[PDB]
Design a protein around this ligand. Sequence first.
Ligand SMILES: Nc1ncnc2c1ncn2[C@@H]1O[C@H](COP(=O)(O)OP(=O)(O)O)[C@@H](O)[C@H]1O
Lengths: 54, 54, 54, 54, 51, 53, 53, 53, 53, 53, 53
Amino acid sequence: ALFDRLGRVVRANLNDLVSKAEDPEKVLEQAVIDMQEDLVQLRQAVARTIAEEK
Amino acid sequence: ALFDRLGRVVRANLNDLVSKAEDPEKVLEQAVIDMQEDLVQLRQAVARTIAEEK
Amino acid sequence: ALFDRLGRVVRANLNDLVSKAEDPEKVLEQAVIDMQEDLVQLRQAVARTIAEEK
Amino acid sequence: ALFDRLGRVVRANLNDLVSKAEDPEKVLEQAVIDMQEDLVQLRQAVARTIAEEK
Amino acid sequence: SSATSAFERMENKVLDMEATSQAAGELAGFGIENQFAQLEASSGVEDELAA
Amino acid sequence: SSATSAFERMENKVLDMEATSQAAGELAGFGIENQFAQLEASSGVEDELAALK
Amino acid sequence: AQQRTMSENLRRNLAALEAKISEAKTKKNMLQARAKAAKANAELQQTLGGLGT
Amino acid sequence: AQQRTMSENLRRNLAALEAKISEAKTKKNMLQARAKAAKANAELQQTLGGLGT
Amino acid sequence: RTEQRLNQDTQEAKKWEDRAKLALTNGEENLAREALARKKSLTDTAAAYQTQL
Amino acid sequence: RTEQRLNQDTQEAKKWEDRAKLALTNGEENLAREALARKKSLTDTAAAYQTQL
Amino acid sequence: RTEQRLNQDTQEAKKWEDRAKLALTNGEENLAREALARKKSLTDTAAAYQTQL
Ligand SMILES: Nc1ncnc2c1ncn2[C@@H]1O[C@H](COP(=O)(O)OP(=O)(O)O)[C@@H](O)[C@H]1O
């Protein structure tokens, strides 16, 4: 229990330190960029299943 | 038995120290993450179970 | 108890010294700043409370 | 209390030293420059929400 | 990386000069009322006269 | 070591902090309800006078 | 038939536990809000209070 | 027939994905603008605020 | 400065009076009551300023 | 500059004033209301400028 | 100094005394008593001050 609680304290503190140092606006922007990229890849992927259908 | 009582006292003191180091905003959130992480694994098991049925 | 009385005398003298070092024009103003700083934090809590309601 | 009062004396003195050394006319001017810049940025920002509306 | 958090940061930044929401709400109400209150009234009468 | 027990500890901690704030307010000099009640009566008679005219 | 019987047991359990987690998540948010509120309330009462030096 | 209905489902997921992304972009930009409005407001609170320099 | 604050608060109170009577006339009584509360709040604030002046 | 701002809004206000008058003469209520509201907005802005001036 | 505080306590005592009349009219024994008690505290301080003066 002692070290299990220790882990919880440590993980929580670390996640907050990462969040603090990090700039969420850049990350949000980056997330949208990545989603857009995945979307493009899926469109190509869909196109290949269409091609196989044909 | 004094050794065991001593151990109990030490463990209680350590438990109090780590309890104090807790901060609700980080810790409460951290608990939800854990429950989420665990759920993802159970779903994957159900995923396989469904696949086998099929 | 003479030790405690001595401590009291010393603390009173130090309190008088720091009281004397005060200058109302700077200090009064400084007090308002503090009350303002504190208010900004309480408002942010209310900000979150409202967001959650929504 | 002693050191809490000490802090108040020190912060008040420091803010006044900063104010004294500083030239408020340049700061006022600079403030207006910054407000104007923010205004321009908001106008662009508004334009993007208009663009998305369209 | 989440939009929900992005909202929260913005929402909090505003709470720098108030946003109890009782502001905009009450305000807008009276605004819309008073305006359309007369607007419609004066016009309708005025039209018939002019004809 | 369970997440739920960690959650429960913090839930209680927050509730205690709320209770602390309530008590602190009362010790500081709780008014509110005071002002609110007088504002209510004042607005009451004010509505009556407005309604009258 | 056996596969179906057992995979249905898991689905009920998935649903119950999902419900339990989701409760905790929505509670997490409001408790966080509450914690912040309580913290601020205590700080203001001490600062605005005449008590202390 | 099998490949077609598989593809149709995949196509539906694609449409859903695209719609969500569109929404996220809209939300992202309004938030940047709202953030900027808040920043600007804060600077006006500074200049048209209390006493200082 | 006190004079300016006093006059400003007096003017806003007159606006909220007007607003209350307009709302009441339209048949939006709840809004009028609310308006009368805002009127009262500003009347009190202005009064404090008057004595202060 | 303040004078020019006042006059600019007065000039635009007269355009929507006249449009409203033509609309009122024709008996076209909707057009009259639109133009009138625009005129009203510009004249309120002009008033603010006049006071500033 | 003593004169300033004393003359202030006497005025404040009124604020409390008049509020007690209102509380009874509102239908509340409890805050009426509290209002009376707060009136007493200032009355007692003022008494002490006048003698000291
Ligand atoms: N003497 C002063 N009076 C008011 N504000 C000041 C003063 N000196 C500095 N400030 C700055 O102006 C802000 C005033 O606090 P704020 O909470 O915005 O005012 P209010 O609580 O009236 O809305 C503070 O953030 C502070 O940095």
